[PDB]
């Protein structure tokens, strides 16, 4: 953990170049709170997070978030979430600094972005688990994540899912309501901040990995994901019909075993949800 001159995240970014990797810049993909560029420091490959607001947040909601983030991660190291180096405030704008993931999100992953290869049952299994591990850590040291989704759950040179975004990160009510509607909880919606938020949440991330779709496609009947789940309890779908044909290598039980955690986990009220013990317990005797 350092601070950067925002000068040097600058230079080694090729003055945060917006272009894509594919082009040739350094743009690696964006958000509601700014854009990921892939940087070199301290003779390593590093990801910079420069912040802005690309949504309707105050300058100092953004500091907030960066302050909240450096707070919650500076010290922090578990196998399932990202690790920050650093950080810059000294320039034009606030900058994070983490370890590089070369696989980048498991939205990216699953929608085989650039013409990467499809993840196979085996990697994703692995991958659900991995998450899972990584949101009980934040649950036991009593932290709400508030945004989780494929978006936020990145993959090392070994495909280990590590969780991202801490921007947000802290039953109790809230009037300033963030988050992906797509993934939200219907309680998160009204204002709520529980962890059982995050377990719905994860409940559309295993669905993401069992379909391949995204949790909201605006070309697509239905648009949401969890509508599908809905439809498929109601016996309008079947969930073979949605298992993501770009594997080769998924049996029915498992898959099914999988959809089972997810259905549980996207109860519309929260207190009929697992906790993230629980999904950790199901999703480890879904591989035995
Ligand atoms: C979107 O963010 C990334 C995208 C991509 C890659 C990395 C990142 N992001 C980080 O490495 C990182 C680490 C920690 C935290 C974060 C934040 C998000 C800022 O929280 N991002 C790599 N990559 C190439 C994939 S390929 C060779 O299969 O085509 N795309």
Redesign the pocket.
């Known amino acids: 953990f350092h601070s950067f001159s925002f000068y040097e995240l600058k230079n080694v970014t090729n003055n945060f170049d917006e272009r894509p990797?594919s082009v040739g810049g350094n743009k690696?993909?964006?958000?509601g709170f700014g854009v990921?560029y892939?940087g070199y420091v301290n003779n390593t490959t590093?990801?910079?997070?420069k912040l802005a607001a690309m949504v309707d947040i105050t300058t100092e909601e953004l500091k907030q978030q960066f302050d909240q983030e450096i707070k919650v991660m500076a010290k922090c190291q578990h196998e399932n979430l990202?690790?920050?180096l650093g950080f810059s405030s000294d320039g034009d704008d606030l900058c994070?600094v983490?370890?590089?993931?070369?696989?980048?999100?498991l939205l990216?992953?699953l929608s085989c972005?650039?013409?990467?290869p499809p993840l196979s049952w085996h990697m994703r299994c692995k991958i659900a688990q991995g998450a899972a591990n990584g949101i009980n850590f934040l649950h036991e040291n009593h932290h709400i994540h508030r945004d989780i989704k494929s978006?936020?759950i990145?993959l090392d040179e070994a495909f280990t899912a590590?969780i991202?975004?801490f921007g947000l990160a802290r039953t109790v009510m809230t009037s300033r309501i963030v988050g992906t509607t797509a993934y939200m909880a219907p309680e998160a919606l009204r204002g709520e901040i529980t962890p059982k938020s995050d377990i719905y949440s994860f409940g559309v991330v295993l669905l993401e990995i069992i379909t391949g779709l995204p949790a909201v496609d605006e070309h697509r009947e239905p648009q949401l994901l969890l509508d599908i789940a809905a439809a498929i309890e109601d016996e309008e779908k079947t969930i073979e019909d949605y298992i993501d044909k770009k594997m080769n290598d998924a049996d029915s039980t498992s898959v099914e075993a999988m959809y089972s955690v997810a259905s549980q986990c996207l109860h519309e009220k929260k207190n009929k949800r697992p906790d993230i013990k629980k999904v950790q317990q199901l999703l480890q005797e879904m591989t035995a």
């Open positions: 990797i690696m993909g964006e958000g990921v892939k590093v990801a910079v997070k990202v690790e920050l994070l983490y370890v590089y993931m070369p696989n980048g999100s990216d992953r972005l650039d013409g990467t978006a936020n990145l590590k991202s975004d």
